[PDB]
Design a protein around this ligand. Structure first.
Ligand SMILES: [Cl-]
Ligand SMILES: [Cl-]
Ligand SMILES: [Cl-]
Lengths: 89, 89, 89
């Protein structure tokens, strides 16, 4: 299993919020960070099985392209254990 | 050593802020993230020795239960080095 | 390659924003988190080659010193793959 983190610099921002939502990357979470002129950036994170890493990287890149794409970086790192809990509404 | 990250979806939110504080998980940090209807979620992170991982996972789950528990996910990942600095006030 | 995460507690805050900027740590991103009295903290993240880890740790510590330094923690963890994309403005 791997964690995928992407830090991307929106140009067409709102267009990229839409990109991210339309991308259909289930379980992805997003937060704002700043890089350096302080630059607002989006940070995306998701944990997937090893066999899914390239697929998710591709969806992130394709989403970024529909917006900016500008500058961005993606990191893949190991995950030892995951526990996922779902409760019906 | 391991990093533990939990992303949890508050139902009884304020009740879960209280849960997290009462839990006594020393050094835990918390931030807000969003998942997808944008859903506000809490992200908790802590780094512990390997022998402490299950204990901390259990405290996080028990805290979540006092609030929602709803949906949540916990990831355990490796840490190579830690440096911790304390200065007296 | 390694990810370096630092969570630091500003005393002379603004002085430490300046410290972080002056530090010249290219590509570092920063976000706010909270630890526990809720305490606002800064989280810094950067991914570097293994040979650069000590250099970056030293710059973070030196920056923290110009401000507080107070309390802080630094974690080094493995990274399997990085993809970095730059587009000219
Ligand atoms: Cl996930
Ligand atoms: Cl910690
Ligand atoms: Cl980086």
């Amino acid at each position: 299993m791997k964690k995928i983190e992407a830090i991307i610099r929106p140009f067409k921002l709102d267009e990229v919020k839409i990109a991210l939502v339309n991308a259909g990357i289930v379980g992805m979470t997003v937060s704002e960070v700043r890089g350096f002129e302080f630059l607002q950036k989006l940070k995306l994170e998701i944990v997937v099985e090893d066999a899914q890493v390239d697929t998710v990287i591709d969806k992130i890149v394709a989403a970024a392209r529909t917006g900016e794409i500008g500058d961005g970086k993606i990191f893949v790192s190991p995950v030892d254990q995951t526990i996922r809990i779902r409760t019906g509404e």
